[PDB]
């Protein structure tokens with residue numbers, strides 16, 4: 001699914017524990033990266049610029065329909081591969097196409113059941129987002145939450161620390177769901 005031969009996403013979740021899950025991927029249609037250029041900055045570490053440098057098959061889009069219907073605020077991600085690597089993981093939160101947060105983290109492979117796992121677990125969600133979410137959930141209507149969320153996106157770049165090569169670049173876009181329907185996601189490939 002979300003993956004190359006070199007690196008695959010296995011789980012991604014953002015949550016609040018008193019455990020509520022805003023989003024959750026547990027583990028394909030195309031989309032033209034040009035469609036979403038204005039949703040991320042034009043600067044260095046910009047989506048157009050990244051996609052230029054390649055490689056094209058490393059770039060994905062997740063659309064999330066999140067659950068704001070509910071503390072410790074955390075982000076748990078887990079990747080896997082067959083090669084032993086050290087990862088640089090860069091998450092950039094963007095608001096109206098401006099980068100407002102960059103979080104840079106590192107994770108060395110751990111051997112388990114004959115593959116290498118990379119566990120970035122219960123990382124504390126930055127306070128920009130915790131505050132943002134507290135506000136967002138005050139809103140009286142879903143359609144108002146989606147309006148606000150049309151201007152909010154996240155870009156995650158995962159690179160081989162030692163070689164500097166891109167392994168994965170994921171663009172995330174957001175709406176809210178009803179609690180009836182629950183959290184949902186749709187993974188796409190980015191093409192050009």
Ligand SMILES: CCCCCCCCCCCCCC(=O)O
Nearest residue numbers: 014022066075091103125126174
């Ligand atoms: C609108 C619902 C958004 C909730 C999900 C959060 C998105 C994933 C977290 C991005 C990476 C963490 C960034 C950081 O807090 O430093």
